[PDB]
Structures are given as structure tokens and as C-alpha cells.
Design an enzyme around this catalytic site. Structure first.
Site, PDB file in Angstrom:
ATOM      1  N   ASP C  62       0.839  -1.220   0.000  1.00 17.85           N
ATOM      2  CA  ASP C  62       0.000   0.000   0.000  1.00 17.85           C
ATOM      3  C   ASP C  62       0.857   1.247   0.000  1.00 17.85           C
ATOM      4  OD1 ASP C  62      -2.255  -1.620   0.086  1.00 17.85           O
ATOM      5  OD2 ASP C  62      -2.535  -1.369   2.264  1.00 17.85           O
ATOM      6  N   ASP C  68      -2.358   7.240   7.901  1.00 20.63           N
ATOM      7  CA  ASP C  68      -1.874   5.907   8.266  1.00 20.63           C
ATOM      8  C   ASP C  68      -0.819   6.047   9.397  1.00 20.63           C
ATOM      9  OD1 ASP C  68      -2.029   4.824   4.773  1.00 20.63           O
ATOM     10  OD2 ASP C  68      -3.423   4.248   6.372  1.00 20.63           O
ATOM     11  N   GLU C  91      -0.963  -3.410  10.251  1.00 22.66           N
ATOM     12  CA  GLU C  91      -0.815  -3.330   8.818  1.00 22.66           C
ATOM     13  C   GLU C  91       0.464  -2.592   8.404  1.00 22.66           C
ATOM     14  OE1 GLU C  91      -3.868  -0.807   6.758  1.00 22.66           O
ATOM     15  OE2 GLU C  91      -3.037  -1.403   4.774  1.00 22.66           O
ATOM     16  N   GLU C  92       0.888  -1.609   9.221  1.00 27.42           N
ATOM     17  CA  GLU C  92       1.875  -0.630   8.819  1.00 27.42           C
ATOM     18  C   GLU C  92       3.280  -1.026   9.216  1.00 27.42           C
ATOM     19  OE1 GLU C  92       1.190   1.564   6.682  1.00 27.42           O
ATOM     20  OE2 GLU C  92      -0.972   1.160   6.856  1.00 27.42           O
ATOM     21  N   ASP C 112      -5.710  -2.665  12.109  1.00 28.23           N
ATOM     22  CA  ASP C 112      -5.560  -1.843  10.913  1.00 28.23           C
ATOM     23  C   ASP C 112      -5.819  -0.449  11.442  1.00 28.23           C
ATOM     24  OD1 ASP C 112      -7.241  -1.907   7.613  1.00 28.23           O
ATOM     25  OD2 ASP C 112      -5.815  -0.484   8.464  1.00 28.23           O
ATOM     26  N   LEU C 114      -5.904   2.557  10.199  1.00 26.99           N
ATOM     27  CA  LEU C 114      -6.767   3.426   9.377  1.00 26.99           C
ATOM     28  C   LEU C 114      -7.165   2.627   8.151  1.00 26.99           C
ATOM     29  CD1 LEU C 114      -7.944   6.391   9.622  1.00 26.99           C
ATOM     30  CD2 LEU C 114      -6.264   7.016   7.995  1.00 26.99           C
ATOM     31  N   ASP C 115      -8.413   2.176   8.082  1.00 30.28           N
ATOM     32  CA  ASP C 115      -8.862   1.386   6.935  1.00 30.28           C
ATOM     33  C   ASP C 115      -9.718   2.257   6.031  1.00 30.28           C
ATOM     34  OD1 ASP C 115     -10.630  -1.163   5.683  1.00 30.28           O
ATOM     35  OD2 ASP C 115     -11.823   0.498   6.479  1.00 30.28           O
ATOM     36  N   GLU C 274      -8.118  -7.355   9.192  1.00 28.29           N
ATOM     37  CA  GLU C 274      -9.350  -6.995   8.506  1.00 28.29           C
ATOM     38  C   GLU C 274     -10.343  -8.140   8.543  1.00 28.29           C
ATOM     39  OE1 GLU C 274      -7.725  -3.721   5.107  1.00 28.29           O
ATOM     40  OE2 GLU C 274      -7.403  -5.833   4.815  1.00 28.29           O
TER      41      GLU C 274
HETATM   42  O1  LIG Z   1     -10.886  -0.662  -4.370  1.00 27.32           O
HETATM   43  P1  LIG Z   1     -11.159  -2.079  -3.991  1.00 27.32           P
HETATM   44  O2  LIG Z   1     -10.357  -3.153  -4.735  1.00 27.32           O
HETATM   45  O3  LIG Z   1     -12.674  -2.349  -4.166  1.00 27.32           O
HETATM   46  O4  LIG Z   1     -10.799  -2.141  -2.409  1.00 27.32           O
HETATM   47  C1  LIG Z   1     -11.748  -1.755  -1.425  1.00 27.32           C
HETATM   48  C2  LIG Z   1     -11.202  -2.288  -0.123  1.00 27.32           C
HETATM   49  O5  LIG Z   1      -9.876  -1.850   0.097  1.00 27.32           O
HETATM   50  C3  LIG Z   1      -9.725  -1.381   1.422  1.00 27.32           C
HETATM   51  O6  LIG Z   1      -9.444  -0.002   1.276  1.00 27.32           O
HETATM   52  C4  LIG Z   1      -8.542  -1.940   2.194  1.00 27.32           C
HETATM   53  O7  LIG Z   1      -7.414  -1.825   1.359  1.00 27.32           O
HETATM   54  C5  LIG Z   1     -11.000  -1.724   2.156  1.00 27.32           C
HETATM   55  O8  LIG Z   1     -11.309  -0.770   3.134  1.00 27.32           O
HETATM   56  C6  LIG Z   1     -12.035  -1.809   1.044  1.00 27.32           C
HETATM   57  O9  LIG Z   1     -12.967  -2.831   1.302  1.00 27.32           O
HETATM   58 MG   LIG Z   2      -7.998  -1.813   5.721  1.00 27.63          MG
HETATM   59 MG   LIG Z   3      -5.154   0.644   6.772  1.00 24.34          MG
HETATM   60 MG   LIG Z   4      -3.299   0.341   3.474  1.00 28.43          MG
END
Ligand SMILES: O=P(O)(O)OC[C@H]1O[C@](O)(CO)[C@@H](O)[C@@H]1O
Ligand SMILES: [Mg+2]
Ligand SMILES: [Mg+2]
Ligand SMILES: [Mg+2]
Ligand SMILES: O=P(O)(O)OC[C@H]1O[C@](O)(CO)[C@@H](O)[C@@H]1O
Ligand SMILES: O=P(O)(O)OC[C@H]1O[C@](O)(CO)[C@@H](O)[C@@H]1O
Ligand SMILES: O=P(O)(O)OC[C@H]1O[C@](O)(CO)[C@@H](O)[C@@H]1O
Ligand SMILES: [Mg+2]
Ligand SMILES: [Mg+2]
Ligand SMILES: [Mg+2]
Ligand SMILES: [Mg+2]
Ligand SMILES: [Mg+2]
Ligand SMILES: [Mg+2]
Ligand SMILES: [Mg+2]
Ligand SMILES: [Mg+2]
Ligand SMILES: [Mg+2]
Lengths: 329, 329, 329, 329
Positions: C62, C68, C91-92, C112, C114-115, C274
């Protein structure tokens, strides 16, 4: 509540009557933004490490504090950007600030950006004080335009950073109190057309200067403690921040004194941005404001940073004191 | 800042040392929640229409205010729900509150839910005061368990709703100040292990009672205005809210007085939830706290609502006053 | 309201039952402080200039953002200082963080910080995700202790920074929602013991990957648009932040999918911080959570950063999909 | 920071150029107050018990919610009190509101007081939408004055209650984003003169209606998933609140669709207070906004509550779709 009398609205409507350039509203409206920013930094000042000296002395000899500097930049910038002002006088600047031509408006504003300096570190209530005059001259704007008597004031008042944040605003018709609502950051009308009691039960003065007081103040204080008619003595209150002591005096009534003393012919409070705004509020509220010898609002200043004794409050208490001075004269 | 010393953390660590039930933490932690709720209602009290009487008189004759009632319900409920208390004493309740058996813990808490009543409407700083004792008895909990001398205190302090909101907390090892951060609603450590100056320059008393003062207070005040050694006179400060005047006294040093007078053999401040907590803070800070004749913390109360003179502050100032009283005795 | 069920209180009472070291409370209590700090920085992120890259790549590729980094430092520090944790997985961070011996407690926390990264700049709702395991081993703490199946979870949930800030918390007995009150900075119980509907009307998947989907997902989506029984088609929702899409799925019911695709054998979402926490919430709420071939909570991880397909939601919808996969197997 | 570009200031300066009655500023300034009040109630809506139905149906058949009612009273009252408006159209009122003569100004304002209704309870981002027209007629103000094409708009935009609160404002010269600062309750300029990318990578539509779509939308969606040139497929995003999906489309680029379907000749979104304001923003940002057959901004409405298909976004994506429709026509 879904109908909200804010300071912003209340101001259009008032000055709506006298059809106007509306730049007073822009002015007062910019001052609120400065007031909310100061209110916010003050509520978290020890967490932001905002207590301390800045490391300079101002023209009247005050040891400058970080919050003096922050609140002063905040007030200067929002006043300029309002396009409603041409001359600014502040406690914290040696000379009058002349506004750059593109941003000029017709108002001169005198202000104390943070009053209550002795009370910052101990978390006692503190404030911001201001007075607004229209420019009278046709000359290029100068320090001269700030040298008008307090009777020429078009607007005056103060912000109080107390248990709550209040904006007290006096204009030609009267005095109104607006309380800051922290959740939506608006000033909301809470007290309409305030009037101070004819007579109070509180006297507010720093009695540590007893040895320097003139015989009129001395007699007056002794009379507050030992009433000649055997009425109850007055209570004493001295918070030590002008804005807090004047505000209580407005709401509960009574008297506030920072008199000339043997050491200071002119007292300590500053005429342009402490004494006049407070005296204008008091007079608009039905009270009085005097040096002991003449009305604060009639003095023609000769120096932007000059000092003046001040005695202000309910008319009956302030008059009893004036009589003592006449009796001694 | 991403490392945050909160009152919550600082408390685990301290009492971590003496391995504990940890219910003191639960207790102090519930008191913060009550303190933030009060801080919030007070910052918007005129907008919420929270200034006014409630329409009752409390046991010591105070005209009760809406904010007295709100802050008192808030403190009672959070104390119960902490499972750390068995007896509560409040200014606002005739008798001690006994906690229902399911929610009992080992602590007795005395408190003034809102101190500063004369100062609510004029926006002057106001507060909350508390002292915590461990239950000593084996008997079913009763009012008796609140009748211990102030020396038995395990924790004491106050919240100050001033320009900022501060939680001052004294425990066996010392005094620490935490400032409330409005944005995240945590109490953050700002002053660690506070100590009051040996000697101050400020005296704080209501001089409106000059006619009722005993000759020791009278002489002491005259000495503050006319120093015998020709040193500078003390400044005077009396905000009029115990919490504010004591807090300044802690930070800047000096002396605070609410002495017995001709009218009141026992003074006005209340022993259990005003005098003891303040005297415990002062002593833990290196200062003193006396009636004029004995240490506040040694008095064995006989009435939950009894009053006591109090003189507190820097040890050198408080001692000079004690000497005057000994000189007169 | 003067009786306040906060997340803090609700937690003592629950774990009060099973008499405990109480360090779970200290843990969850520290996580709230991190959650309020993040909530606050996120509400003003463009004013604080907090949108942007930090300028690194994390272990799963990422592009790292300033937020983050802030939210991750905040979570690490408050977890350490709680004295309740010995191993942290984020995650980080490339590897597991081992807590310094003085601060060790018995819990391992996967999170995680910051998701929702794609949604930061456009102000779409974003979140924080966490799962807590007890340490099982007697060995010195290591990365190994984070390698347990999701069924071993003692606590799991998430913070949602949406139109309001919500803390959803799942433990052995059920799922409870707490809403952050901005004025007093407490988490207040709003939904007690939440259960997801048996069957929903919403399907949530990123249909931009249609070309990579396996035939089970393809058939399932076609069935949602063209029902075989001529019932109303499902509505589609894909916010694009796992925390937001799972949260809606919990409240309204339905199904959320991030399936393995031709390009990704293991899907994109990360198992430890996650997939497992979300699957634990769902199962505690009466829903299901599967890869398409096995329960998410039974997978024994071999890598702290491994990925897993996930399909979660109402049991009837998730089952219909499982049948399609069985039908194709 | 001590120089603060607020939405209030930025507005004087813009309209300062064309010397004005300044009542647009009073108008926008009152709308901010309504926006902050709504933002605040929404951040604590579950604690205030503000989720739920009100128990009525509006003219276009929506099941009304408590927040619809609160946000609608708030917007009506602040618009009236601004003295800048004579006719108000709201989603929530059967007919146009005519402003009482004392409070009349020259502007007609169409607005959706709370958009995003399906997303309130699950905490997904929600909003407020508005468009302002000058009164064109000389007749007494009437519903007629709201029946102008979107090209007559003088100001348009929206508030987004997302992870942060944003006010997007479009006027004749361009689009500017202001973020609400919760600590001082001002709108602060964060994005100046926004322009949408020529071409995006995201398509946003509710695919649950696949069975009702016309062949142009069907082909366009299939092309987004299976590119003819073997470029990467577009990502899909559909938050489900117009304000959120349009906002992302503005910032990241791409396309947003709520097309006519077999069931709805006119689509679902409402022309006066959803489609026109969004299309005006898009056009001022360099994007496009079309029904599939004509520009949204050219439609002369015949009914204040009429609906319109809408397809809006980057010009290259919106054009590719228009071509498909021309190809089918
Ligand atoms: O853009 P994509 O492939 O649909 O990813 C969405 C997913 O990615 C995330 O940002 C995590 O990377 C989730 O929060 C979300 O469900
Ligand atoms: Mg996430
Ligand atoms: Mg995150
Ligand atoms: Mg990330
Ligand atoms: O300490 P002193 O001499 O009583 O001064 C108090 C006065 O000083 C001020 O701080 C201004 O310098 C006022 O706010 C207050 O009235
Ligand atoms: O008005 P008086 O007699 O000086 O009382 C002031 C004292 O009263 C109190 O309000 C408590 O009643 C204290 O906070 C303060 O110290
Ligand atoms: O659920 P649907 O049919 O996709 O409707 C979504 C649309 O409805 C609205 O809630 C308005 O009714 C919009 O905010 C959103 O774009
Ligand atoms: Mg000064
Ligand atoms: Mg001053
Ligand atoms: Mg000053
Ligand atoms: Mg009382
Ligand atoms: Mg008291
Ligand atoms: Mg009290
Ligand atoms: Mg609706
Ligand atoms: Mg809408
Ligand atoms: Mg609506």
C-alpha cells in the site's frame, strides 16, 4: 432550536435600519472569528504550551505573554481582511497600524487583544476589549484618527473567556450579551438590552494599595465596611481581570475601581482600549464611569497609550464616590 | 502528539505500584466523566437556560441553583456505577447516601458538586470539590463512615471550570494537574508534582466583613497593606469562588482566608467537602491549612455539614498569621 | 442525562462477572483514547493538511498516507502504555511489535490503524479495525503468538469515522454499539446486543472486477439482478471502505464480498486485522463469514500479513452463495 | 494560524468586485449556520435519538425522517432571517414557501435539506444540497420564480457530512471547497478553483437495477468491465448518497449515473434541488451533466418536484456515454 438569534443576524437587522455600507457587520463579524479562535486556544493553553513570556516589553511596560502575541496577530489580520478598517490601535504595538489602501474601510478600532495577564496561568477568566470609532478626518489615515474622546464611539464591548465565553456588545441603542455556543461556533443572544441596577452591594478594588490611595477612596472603602446607617456592609470582589470585574459589575451591579494613586497620577488602566470601551458599555447600560473628577468618555486623549483612573458601576454607588471627591476637593 | 499522559493512565501506574483492587481508578475515572459533563453544560449554561434557582434550600441554607442539581445528579450516578463507593456525602443532600449493596465498593466520597454559586451568573470561574476516604469500619456502611478527620484522606482535589478546565489531584505522594482537552475529552497531565512557594505576595479574603473580623485577622491585613519592614505591600485577590482562589494560591503562592468571624464561630466553608479536600491538596503541595488555632486535617467532625474557619497557603504566610493568633491568645 | 452508560462502565461490569485482572478494560480504554484522537484529526484533516502520501510502501504494497502514520503511532503508544499487551500486529509494520518487558500484559492485538485509504481524500467514511487474543504460549512473546485462528478471539471490533463516530465492540456474549459524544468525549451505548437480519436486500461488491470473478460470484451477482422467483432485485451498495460496508451490512443486513479473483488467489483483504475481526463481529451478531470454501475464523495463519477472500453477512444470503460454490466445486 | 481564509471573507471579496447589495453574503452566511447546526446534530444523532421516521410522506413519496424535519426547519428559518430570499423550494414541502414581506430579498433558493436518507442509520455520509436563483419576474413572488432552468443559477453547491464536514460552493467563476473546523466553527478554504480530471477510472451507479436499464447504460457498464482496448477496467463505487458519490466524482474524477430506467421515465433524482445544483457544480468544474439526451441545466421545469435522469462527471467519460445513446437513438 431551529430559530437562532446569532450576533451576525442581530447586527444586520440593527444597522439595517440605517441603511449602511454594512461594513460594521463585516467588522464585528471578523472580530467574532478572532474571538472564537482565542477562546479555543485559551481553553487548551496548557496542553498547547501557550502559557509563558514571549520575551519583550510593550510600550506601557508589560511583560508580554505568548497569548498576548497570538491573540494580537489574530485580531490584526481579521480586522484588515474585513475591509472595514483604516487605523488599528493595540496595546501590543508601539504605534497605530495603518491599513494598506486596498483593504481600507472607514473604521478605527482600539483594542486590548488579551486583558487579564496576571490571571492567565492560574486559569482565571480573561478577555478581549475593543472600541470602534468612525474616521472623522479627510486627511490620509493616521494615529490622529485614534485620538478621539470616548463619546465619539459607535460600537464598544468585550469578550469574556470565563466559565463560558460571552461577547458583550454596546452600540448607540443599548447593550446586548451573546454567549458563544461551542458546538456550532456561533454567538447567541442571551441578554437583551441590559441595564445595571441603580444601586449595588459589591465593591471591587485592589486593597493592597491602601497605602497609596487618596483620601476620597480611603473614606469610601471605610464607608463600605462600616455603613453609617447600619445597613449591611458591601461584599468585596476583585477577580483581578478588568473584563471579569466589569462584567460582574454589569450583571449584579455595584462598583469597580482602579483609581489614581500616590504612585500613579493617571492610574494603571489604559484609556483607549480599556477605559473607554468599558465606560461606553456602562453608560449604554445606564451606569456611570468617571476618573473621580470627570467623565472618562469626555477626555480628549493626546497619547494612544495614555492611562486614566476609572470608577464605574451603578449610578448611585459611583455618585456617592464622586460626592466624596467633591467633598475633598 | 501520539503519546498522551492522560489522568486515566497516570492513575493505573501509580496505584499499580501497590497492587490494588483498582477501584480507585474506576472511581476517579467515573468522576472525570461527571467533570466533563459538568464542564460542557457550564460552557453553554445561558444558551441551555441553566442559570436560575431550582427552588429549594439545602441543609446549610444555600439557595439551590439548577446547576447545583444537574452537577449533583451527575456526580451521584457516576459514583454509584463505579462499584467503588459505599457512602456519598454531598452539600446538596441532607443525609449521607448509602449505596445499594450490588454497587458497593470500599470508598466514601465527600463532595461539593458545584462550588462558587455566587459566581455562576456573571460567568466567573466555578468548580467541583471532592475527598475520598477508605471505609474503616466493619459495620454496615453509614453516615458514620464519612465522619473521619481529613488526615485519613486517600485522595482529594477539585475541578476548576475556568478559562480552561483543570483537574487538580492530590494523593499520598503529591499533587498533579491535568488539563481537559476539549477536542478528545481526556484529562492531560500538565503540571507534575506541584509545590507551592515558601512565601507569596498575595492575600485573598473578603474584606467586606472587616467589622466582624477578629483582631488577629485585622492586624494581619493591616500588616499586608503597611509592611513593617517597608517591603512592597501584598496584592489583593478575591475571585469569590473557593476553587479559583485556592487554585491561584497553589500556583502563584500566597494566602487564602475564610476566617471565623463575630457572626460565625465556625466560618462559612464546609469541613467535609470544602475545607478538608483543599487542606489535603495544600499539605500535599508543601503548604499549610489551619483554623487559626488547629490544623484543619486533625478535626474529628461530628456533623457531615459542619463548617470550619480556614486559612491556607504558603507555609511562611500561614505561619506569620498563626503567630498573630498566638500572640492574641 | 445524568446517567450515562459509557463503554468504560459497560466493560467493567461485563468482565466484572469473571473476576479478572481488569487489564482488558485498561486495554479497551486506551484504544478509545486512540480512537477519539484519530476521530478528531480526521474531522479536520484538510485544515491540518493531513491528506497526502507519507512516502513509503508497506509490506502488502500500500502507498502509505500521513493519516496511516499518525493513527498507527497513536494506536501503538496507547496500547503499550496500557500494560495489557505483549505483541502488536499492525498493517503498517513489517514485523510484530514486541512490547518492552516493564509494560507487558497478556494480550496480543492485531489492528488496521486506518482502513479505507482510497476514501480518505474524498471524505468518505473510514475506520480502525482490531482484534484481541490472549497469549497462549509460555515462551517469550513473539510473532508466533499473533498466528492464531480467529476463533481464538476474546474481543474484536472497529471504529467507524462516518457521519458520526461509532465504536462497535464484539465479545464472547454479543455485539454492542457505542457512539462517540463529541461534547464530553465518551463512547455511549446506543445499540445493545445487535443481531443481523436472517436475510437482507443489499449486495455489496466491487463489480469493476467482473472479468476476474470466479463463476460462483458471477452467478450469484446475476441472481441478485435477475431473481429466479421474480422477487425484487437486491439494491447495490459499495462504499469502498470495508468498515463502512460491513457496518451497513450489520445494521441493515445483506451481504458483503471481497472474493478471491483470477488475479488474487487470496483476495485482497488481510486476514489478521481486517478479515478476522469483521468475521468475529458477524458471527457474534448471528451472521456468517466464509472464503467461499471455509469459515474465515478457522484458518490458521502462517503469515501475519496474509490475505483471504471474505464473504460475510446475513446467514441466508451467505448460505445461498456457499451453495453456488458447492454447486461448482 | 492567525490568518484565516473563511467562507465568510472569501465571499465578501468575490462579490465585492461587483458592487452588490451584499445579501448573497448574508444568504450564504445564514446557510453556513444552518449547516453547522445540522453537522452537529448528525455527529450525535444516535445519542440524541434523532434516527427514525417522523411519520409522514413527502410529495415525491419519501418516508420522512426526524433529521429531514430538523434540518428542514433549520434551513427555512435561517433563510428567512437573512432578508435575502423571497421564495424557498424544499424537498419536504408540498409547495413553494413565500417569504413574509418584511423579510424579502431578491433570491429564490431550492434545497434538499438532508440528502442520503437510506444512509442515515448506518452512519454513511449524508448531505445538504442547494441552488440559488435571482428573481427574474416583477410579479409578486410565487412558485413560478422557482421554475427557471439550471443555467440561470447564480450560486449552487452542497454540504457533505462525511469523515469531515465540507461546504462545496460553485459560483459564476468556479468551484471552491471549504472545510468546517469544529473547534472554531468556521468554514475554511481548502481547495481553490477545483477542476475535475478530463478522464476518470471510476463508475458509480446502482447496478441492482440492471434489469430495468436502457441498452445505452447496459453497453456502457459492460464496456467499463470489459474494456475494448484491453485497458484496466474501471473501479466501481456507489456510496448511495448523491452528495458523497458526486463529491468523490469531483475530486477523483470519473462518472456518476442515476439514469431513466424502464420503471422511471424521469429517473429518481429531483431536478430543482438535486440535479441542477450538482450539474452546476460539475459544469463550473469543467465537467458535464446530461440526461442521456440533453443538458440538465437547459431543462425548463414545469413542476417544482419533477425528477430527471442524470449522468455527470469527467467530460470524456460523460461524452463516451452520450455517444452510446446517440448510437442507439
Ligand atoms: O478498491 P477495492 O479493490 O474495491 O478495495 C476496497 C477495499 O480496500 C480497502 O481499502 C482496504 O485496502 C478496504 O477498506 C475496502 O474494502
Ligand atoms: Mg484496511
Ligand atoms: Mg489501513
Ligand atoms: Mg493500506
Ligand atoms: O494587579 P492590579 O494592580 O490590581 O491590576 C489588575 C488590572 O490589571 C489588568 O490586568 C490590566 O493590566 C486588568 O485586567 C486588571 O484590572
Ligand atoms: O461571598 P463570601 O462570603 O465571600 O463567600 C465566598 C465563598 O462562598 C463560596 O461560594 C461557597 O459558598 C465559596 O466558593 C467562596 O469562597
Ligand atoms: O437506492 P437508490 O435507488 O440507488 O437511490 C440512491 C439515491 O437516492 C438518494 O438517497 C436520494 O433519494 C440519493 O442521495 C442517492 O443518490
Ligand atoms: Mg499587558
Ligand atoms: Mg488589559
Ligand atoms: Mg492585554
Ligand atoms: Mg451552595
Ligand atoms: Mg462550595
Ligand atoms: Mg456547591
Ligand atoms: Mg427524501
Ligand atoms: Mg436527496
Ligand atoms: Mg432529502
Amino acid at each position: 432550536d431551529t430559530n437562532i438569534v446569532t450576533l451576525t443576524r442581530f447586527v444586520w437587522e440593527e444597522g439595517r435600519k440605517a441603511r449602511g455600507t454594512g461594513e460594521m457587520t463585516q467588522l464585528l463579524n471578523s472580530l467574532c472569528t478572532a474571538v472564537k479562535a482565542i477562546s479555543t486556544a485559551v481553553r487548551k493553553a496548557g496542553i498547547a504550551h501557550l502559557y509563558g513570556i514571549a520575551g519583550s516589553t510593550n510600550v506601557t511596560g508589560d511583560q508580554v505573554k505568548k497569548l498576548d502575541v497570538l491573540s494580537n496577530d489574530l485580531v490584526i489580520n481579521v480586522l484588515k481582511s474585513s475591509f472595514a478598517t483604516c487605523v488599528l490601535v493595540s496595546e501590543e504595538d508601539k504605534n497605530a497600524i495603518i491599513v494598506e489602501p486596498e483593504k481600507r474601510g472607514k473604521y478605527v478600532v482600539c483594542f486590548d487583544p488579551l486583558d487579564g495577564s496576571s490571571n492567565i496561568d492560574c486559569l482565571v477568566s480573561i478577555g478581549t476589549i475593543f472600541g470602534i470609532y468612525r474616521k472623522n478626518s479627510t486627511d490620509e489615515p493616521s494615529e490622529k484618527d485614534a485620538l478621539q474622546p470616548g463619546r465619539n464611539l459607535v460600537a464598544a464591548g468585550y469578550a469574556l473567556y470565563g466559565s463560558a465565553t460571552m461577547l458583550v456588545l454596546a452600540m448607540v441603542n443599548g447593550v446586548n450579551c451573546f454567549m458563544l455556543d461551542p458546538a456550532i461556533g456561533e454567538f447567541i443572544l442571551v441578554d437583551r438590552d441590559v441595564k445595571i441596577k441603580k444601586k449595588g452591594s459589591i465593591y471591587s478594588i485592589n486593597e493592597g494599595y491602601a497605602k497609596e490611595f487618596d483620601p476620597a477612596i480611603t473614606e469610601y472603602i471605610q464607608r463600605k465596611k462600616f455603613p453609617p446607617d447600619n445597613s449591611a456592609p458591601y461584599g468585596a470582589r476583585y477577580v483581578g481581570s478588568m473584563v471579569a470585574d466589569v462584567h460582574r459589575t454589569l450583571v449584579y451591579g455595584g462598583i469597580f475601581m482602579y483609581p489614581a494613586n500616590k504612585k500613579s497620577p493617571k492610574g494603571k488602566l489604559r484609556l483607549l482600549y480599556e477605559c473607554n470601551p468599558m465606560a461606553y458599555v456602562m453608560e449604554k447600560a445606564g451606569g456611570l464611569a468617571t476618573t473621580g473628577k470627570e467623565a472618562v468618555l469626555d477626555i480628549v486623549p493626546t497619547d494612544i497609550h495614555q492611562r486614566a483612573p476609572i470608577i464605574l458601576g451603578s449610578p448611585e454607588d459611583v455618585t456617592e464616590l464622586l460626592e466624596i471627591y467633591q467633598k475633598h476637593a
